[PDB]
Amino acid sequence: RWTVAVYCAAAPTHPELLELAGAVGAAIAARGWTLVWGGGHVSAMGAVSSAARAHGGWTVGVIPKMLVHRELADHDADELVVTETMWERKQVMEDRANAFITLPGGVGTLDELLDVWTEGYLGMHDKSIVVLDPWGHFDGLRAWLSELADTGYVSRTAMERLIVVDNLDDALQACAP
Amino acid sequence: RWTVAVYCAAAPTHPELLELAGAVGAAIAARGWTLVWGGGHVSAMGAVSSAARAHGGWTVGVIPKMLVHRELADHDADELVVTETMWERKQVMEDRANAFITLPGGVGTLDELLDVWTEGYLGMHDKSIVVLDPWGHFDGLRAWLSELADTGYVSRTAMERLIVVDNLDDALQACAP
Numbered sequence: 136r137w138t139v140a141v142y143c144a145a146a147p148t149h150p151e152l153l154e155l156a157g158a159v160g161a162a163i164a165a166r167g168w169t170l171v172w173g174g175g176h177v178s179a180m181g182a183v184s185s186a187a188r189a190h191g192g193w194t195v196g197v198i199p200k201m202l203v204h205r206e207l208a209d210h211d212a213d214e215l216v217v218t219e220t221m222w223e224r225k226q227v228m229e230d231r232a233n234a235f236i237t238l239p240g241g242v243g244t245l246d247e248l249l250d251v252w253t254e255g256y257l258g259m260h261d262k263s264i265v266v267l268d269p270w271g272h273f274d275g276l277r278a279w280l281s282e283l284a285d286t287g288y289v290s291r292t293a294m295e296r297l298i299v300v301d302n303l304d305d306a307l308q309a310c311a312p
Numbered sequence: 313r314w315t316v317a318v319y320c321a322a323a324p325t326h327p328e329l330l331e332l333a334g335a336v337g338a339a340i341a342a343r344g345w346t347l348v349w350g351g352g353h354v355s356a357m358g359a360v361s362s363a364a365r366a367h368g369g370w371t372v373g374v375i376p377k378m379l380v381h382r383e384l385a386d387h388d389a390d391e392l393v394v395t396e397t398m399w400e401r402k403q404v405m406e407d408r409a410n411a412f413i414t415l416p417g418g419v420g421t422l423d424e425l426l427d428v429w430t431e432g433y434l435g436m437h438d439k440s441i442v443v444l445d446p447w448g449h450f451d452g453l454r455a456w457l458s459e460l461a462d463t464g465y466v467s468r469t470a471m472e473r474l475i476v477v478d479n480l481d482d483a484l485q486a487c488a489p
């Protein structure tokens with residue numbers, strides 16, 4: 136039943152990120168939790184999903200038709216869903232998930248994070264939103280978001296909607312039912 | 313017929329931002345260009361629509377069923393498209409416009425911008441994506457994205473698609489057919 140969606144890089148392979156993603160996947164799978172992720176075998180997406188599979192967990196991949204070849208659709212997922220549009224991927228992911236973990240990534244990861252955060256802050260769902268950042272990948276973003284908060288562009292209840300942690304033990308504890 | 317979509321705040325309290333959204337509305341309309349916007353008649357959103365209408369410009373407003381009252385749908389929109397879902401708002405907004413201008417705003421504005429920018433560099437559209445930021449509102453975001461490019465998380469293709477200008481003049485020239 137309990138399902139966690141992990142959003143993470145689809146482009147670059149720094150080993151420390153693949154490590155983190157593989158640890159993440161294996162920890163999810165050990166709690167009898169399902170993995171939902173962008174359904175690609177590339178990069179951190181492949182590290183989290185393949186790890187979760189090899190450790191005994193259910194894996195659900197959600198990937199746009201247009202991105203099937205670029206991000207290597209994972210036909211090895213226990214269920215794979217190919218959405219007609221980019222927008223539908225995020226919708227489907229967010230609906231099947233109970234909680235969200237975001238790992239280091241770039242624009243794609245951030246957009247996925249923003250799409251669930253927004254829906255959260257607008258009060259459209261009651262699901263924990265976690266960022267796992269052991270080496271301050273997101274420092275620069277968070278310093279920015281704080282400025283916006285201080286200057287009245289992002290509300291206080293909106294910042295308190297983001298749980299940002301440095302360790303995998305806290306991310307999982309923040310994600311639990 | 314040429315259509316520019318403008319992303320800006322729907323939350324209120326910013327005087328310099330109101331004037332900027334007004335000048336933008338006015339500048340689009342006077343050029344014989346249609347305006348697309350989130351559909352609300354208050355704060356920045358209302359300032360861009362009423363300023364476009366006052367210069368005899370056609371205004372199209374796109375807004376989900378569940379935000380019609382929160383963000384106060386503009387009934388003086390020449391056309392109002394009320395979408396079934398959050399995601400459909402972005403879809404319709406991006407198909408309808410030939411270019412995009414993002415102005416200072418919060419999390420939703422940012423989401424809207426990352427949505428057209430990803431959709432862009434991943435090759436869904438070749439429409440130009442402008443952030444107009446005369447006061448360095450977006451400094452933090454950029455210095456950071458720049459850290460992400462220096463470490464391989466964001467490609468040089470993607471960065472170049474994000475046109476950032478410090479004045480309205482360059483903004484509209486970048487949006488011109």
Ligand SMILES: Nc1ncnc2c1ncn2[C@@H]1O[C@H](COP(=O)(O)O)[C@@H](O)[C@H]1O
Nearest residue numbers: 144145146173221240241242243244430
């Ligand atoms: N607008 C979007 N809708 C759905 N998925 C997205 C969107 N933008 C980016 N992504 C995903 O974000 C990841 C890109 O990774 P990166 O840009 O390396 O963080 C990929 O899994 C993309 O499929």
Ligand SMILES: Nc1ncnc2c1ncn2[C@@H]1O[C@H](COP(=O)(O)O)[C@@H](O)[C@H]1O
Nearest residue numbers: 253320321322323350417418419420421
């Ligand atoms: N997930 C989303 N997709 C499209 N538009 C959004 C989303 N979340 C917020 N918005 C809108 O972005 C605009 C600016 O909001 P903000 O900048 O958060 O004050 C508002 O019209 C929000 O309703």
